[PDB]
Symmetry: C2
Subunit: 126 residues, 2 copies
C-alpha cells in the first residue's frame, strides 16, 4: 500500500525455457522456480523475507515467460487499480496491450505501451 508508481517487478521473455533458466542460474546465480499452474518461472535476484518479498531495499525480483505478450523485457509498475490506471494511461496518450488479468491469487497484471511505444507492465495486489 502507498507503493503506487513504484517499479516492483520485471519479466524476461524466452524462446527456450530450459535454456533461458540455465543461462540466468549459471550467469548470475538467480534462484528460478517453474510454477506450472501460473505458466511462468519465478526469479529471485536478492534476499527475501518470510513473505517472499525483498528484505532489504534496492532491488526487485521478477519472472520469466514464454515470449508473446512480452516480446522483450518489461518492468512492472504498481498501481492501486489497473482499470483506473489504464484509463489514465490512454488519456495521456498510451495504449492498452492486455487488460486486467488475474495472476494466481496474488494479484492482477496488465500491459500497456507508453507514449514512446514501449511495453510496460502494471501490477495490482489482491
Amino acid at each position: 500500500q502507498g507503493m503506487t508508481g513504484r517499479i516492483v517487478h520485471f519479466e524476461i521473455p524466452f524462446d527456450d525455457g530450459d535454456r533461458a533458466r540455465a543461462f540466468y542460474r549459471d550467469a548470475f546465480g538467480w534462484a528460478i522456480a517453474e510454477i506450472p499452474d501460473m505458466d511462468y518461472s519465478m526469479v529471485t535476484t536478492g534476499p527475501v523475507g518470510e513473505s517472499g518479498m525483498p528484505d532489504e531495499p534496492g532491488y526487485i525480483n521478477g519472472g520469466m515467460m514464454q515470449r508473446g505478450e512480452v516480446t522483450t523485457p518489461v518492468v512492472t509498475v504498481d498501481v492501486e487499480s489497473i482499470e483506473s490506471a489504464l484509463e489514465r494511461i490512454e488519456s495521456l496518450g498510451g495504449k492498452t496491450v492486455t487488460g486486467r488479468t488475474p495472476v494466481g491469487n496474488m494479484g492482477f497484471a496488465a500491459y500497456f505501451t507508453d507514449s514512446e511505444g514501449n511495453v510496460v507492465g502494471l501490477w495490482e495486489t489482491a
Copy 2:
C-alpha cells in the same frame, strides 16, 4: 536460497524515448515519477520510490531508474549488479550470451555494459567502482 555473493540483483532499469519532453511528462503524469535531466549526462534520472540521504532506495521492494534517448538502449532494459563486468561478460559469453557494449564508465561511481542473453534479449550490467 543463496546467491553469488551480494551480486546479481536487479537494481536499475532504463526506458528509452523518442521525444524526451513527451516521455517525461507521460510518466510524471501517469504515476508521479520524479524525473530530473542530469547535466551533462544525456540521461534523465527517474525516482519511482523513496530514497534516503544516499539517494538510494530506503524502503524495500522497488527500484529506481533512468530514461534516455533511444539508441544505445533500444527497448526497456533491466540492469544486473555485478562485482566485475569483465568477469560477468566472460561468463555470459561462455554460456551462450554476447557482449553488446563493454565496460564503460558512467557518471562518477561505476561502470555499465550491455549484453544479449541466451534468448536475444538486451540486458544491462552495473559495476560499482571498488
